[PDB]
Amino acid sequence: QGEKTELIQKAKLAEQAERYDDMATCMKAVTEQGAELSNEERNLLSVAYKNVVGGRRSAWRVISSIEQKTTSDKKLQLIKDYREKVESELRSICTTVLELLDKYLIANATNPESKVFYLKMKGDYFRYLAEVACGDDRKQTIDNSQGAYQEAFDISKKEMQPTHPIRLGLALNFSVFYYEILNNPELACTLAKTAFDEAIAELDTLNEDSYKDSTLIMQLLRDNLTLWTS
């Protein structure tokens, strides 16, 4: 289609202009066409929405950092009402990504490599919900990303080698889910140490095309490990 090839160009253009909202509405219209994504379009969509959802997460963390640093004051009400406004935008963003995954991306999965990628993406965007959920809504969204990460974890160990960047990046995010959402730091470290050790034990079964992006994730795996053991 002449429209899809032009939407990718605008998305690539909006990406360098750091206009991720414009980049996100382009890749959303691309996936709404129904055809399974490239590897290029796939990362374009995730990069776009990770920056859109990332801006609201950064704001939410700062407003809440000020919110609990104060109920004597009466000016706190407006602080909370401004946080739920930011929470409101962040909630609607992740649902659009999650419904994009359920309608188009998860179903039309060619290889297991893309299935693990999209199942991990689902676990990430339910995890961003658990960061801001509270009450009966909280444990329900936690179980949803856990189930997403769990199936992606199972498939990745079945069809991917230990040095695969998608497998390594899933163990990274899954172990972060264990540290921050479940608050099991020992299980989180074991999840990250196992992936790092299985990958460092096969660093001859991968070449120059494989290296790099593979250690960037192993570097992050350890970064968390030494930070969590202290």
Binding site: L172, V176, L220
Partner: peptide
Amino acid sequence: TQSLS
């Protein structure tokens, strides 16, 4: 505590 970039 960092996640994937």
